[PDB]
Amino acid sequence: TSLFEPAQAGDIALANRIVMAPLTRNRSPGAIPNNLNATYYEQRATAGLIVTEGTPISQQGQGYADVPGLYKREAIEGWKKITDGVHSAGGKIVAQIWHVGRISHTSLQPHGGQPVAPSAITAKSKTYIINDDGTGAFAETSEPRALTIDDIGLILEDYRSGARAALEAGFDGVEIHAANGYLIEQFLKSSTNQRTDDYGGSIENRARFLLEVVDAVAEEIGAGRTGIRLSPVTPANDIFEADPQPLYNYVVEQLGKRNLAFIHVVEGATGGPRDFKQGDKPFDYASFKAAYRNAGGKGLWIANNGYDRQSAIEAVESGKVDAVAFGKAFIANPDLVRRLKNDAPLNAPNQPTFYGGGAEGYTDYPALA
Ligand SMILES: Cc1cc2nc3c(=O)[nH]c(=O)nc-3n(C[C@H](O)[C@H](O)[C@H](O)COP(=O)(O)O)c2cc1C
Numbered sequence: 043t044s045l046f047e048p049a050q051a052g053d054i055a056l057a058n059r060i061v062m063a064p065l066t067r068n069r070s071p072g073a074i075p076n077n078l079n080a081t082y083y084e085q086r087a088t089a090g091l092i093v094t095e096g097t098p099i100s101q102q103g104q105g106y107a108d109v110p111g112l113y114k115r116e117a118i119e120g121w122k123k124i125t126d127g128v129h130s131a132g133g134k135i136v137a138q139i140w141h142v143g144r145i146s147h148t149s150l151q152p153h154g155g156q157p158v159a160p161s162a163i164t165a166k167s168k169t170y171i172i173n174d175d176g177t178g179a180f181a182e183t184s185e186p187r188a189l190t191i192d193d194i195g196l197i198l199e200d201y202r203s204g205a206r207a208a209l210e211a212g213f214d215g216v217e218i219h220a221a222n223g224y225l226i227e228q229f230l231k232s233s234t235n236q237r238t239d240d241y242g243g244s245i246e247n248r249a250r251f252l253l254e255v256v257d258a259v260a261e262e263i264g265a266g267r268t269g270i271r272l273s274p275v276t277p278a279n280d281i282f283e284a285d286p287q288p289l290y291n292y293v294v295e296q297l298g299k300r301n302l303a304f305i306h307v308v309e310g311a312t313g314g315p316r317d318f319k320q321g322d323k324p325f326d327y328a329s330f331k332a333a334y335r336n337a338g339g340k341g342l343w344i345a346n347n348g349y350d351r352q353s354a355i356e357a358v359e360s361g362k363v364d365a366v367a368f369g370k371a372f373i374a375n376p377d378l379v380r381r382l383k384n385d386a387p388l389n390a391p392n393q394p395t396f397y398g399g400g401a402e403g404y405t406d407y408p409a410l411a
């Protein structure tokens with residue numbers, strides 16, 4: 043199998059195995075995608091699959107300013123322009139449907155409320171907010187409140203409506219954001235979950251919310267249009283788990299039963315070392331993948347974090363992964379697919395323009411002649 047040949051992720055046909063990883067860029071004021079956002083995604087539509095920037099299912103699920111959501115009619119319309127443009131260029135795109143949990147600020151929440159989380163443990167994290175006068179500012183994340191059972195039910199309904207909104211906006215499917223210390227991970231990992239009900243304690247209880255989200259989304263749009271992103275060891279957003287292997291092997295054993303389109307795995311610390319660990323034992327990614335396959339899992343296995351041309355080619359041809367998602371390289375190389383096919387040089391990403399601002403460092407990276 044070649045990185046450059048087509049693949050199938052559930053119901054979604056991919057023209058190649060080069061995936062655009064989800065990338066928050068904070069360029070959608072009012073939580074509504076705009077015409078500049080459409081240019082940005084259309085420039086990258088030769089990707090076998092685009093995963094959008096995280097897109098919240100609700101205002102409660104927002105944690106950063108100027109992030110596009112799926113909870114306004116105007117936002118659905120803005121996304122429809124994007125998916126139509128990507129499709130006209132021959133591409134495929136899934137929405138990364140998001141709930142940040144405790145990684146938020148009161149100024150972003152409905153009613154000025156506390157962010158919600160499995161347990162009321164404040165993150166040592168920072169976010170991007172807008173003041174009353176319209177000025178932007180960095181802020182420490184706010185003190186969260188612990189979710190009630192009824193609150194959890196309401197969030198599940200928000201995942202249902204968000205998945206439905208994604209289909210209405212023309213997406214080929216969704217990627218459930220269950221990575222990088224956000225709400226689902228807060229339930230999964232030990233440092234954030236001190237609950238004493240059916241959603242805390244045991245591995246089965248800590249995985250319960252994740253699997254309820256998956257089953258809610260899959261029932262709404264079809265398991266063949268549902269994928270999920272996982273990040274077993276990442277330290278993102280102040281989260282810690284000492285024993286990820288039994289936890290995550292259990293999670294994917296259960297996901298292997300659900301006929302999902304794809305599993306997207308961050309290998310290591312997100313944006314940092316691939317060999318990162320938090321606990322005493324290194325994580326075994328082969329054992330993790332085998333737990334999924336041995337349970338019947340047939341989703342496309344998409345790997346991320348620190349790949350380059352040679353390692354991506356080797357990982358697919360060896361059968362370790364089915365596809366490779368690139369993040370920073372897609373920021374800087376709209377025609378990454380052609381550059382990799384031809385072994386052409388890549389543009390370097392400009393970190394200062396990753397977040398916020400306008401076209402500079404967003405739509406003005408050049409393609410090849
Ligand atoms: C600017 C930026 C924004 C990101 N936004 C998201 C996001 O919205 N969702 C997500 O799951 N990961 C997000 N990530 C992580 C990337 O998807 C990816 O895992 C990371 O960049 C490592 O891959 P790479 O080595 O190919 O860059 C972001 C990373 C960067 C650099």
Ligand SMILES: C=C(C(=O)O)c1ccccc1
Pocket residue numbers: 066096106221222278312
């Ligand atoms: C959605 C993100 C993630 O998953 O880490 C994110 C958010 C803000 C900046 C970078 C990344």
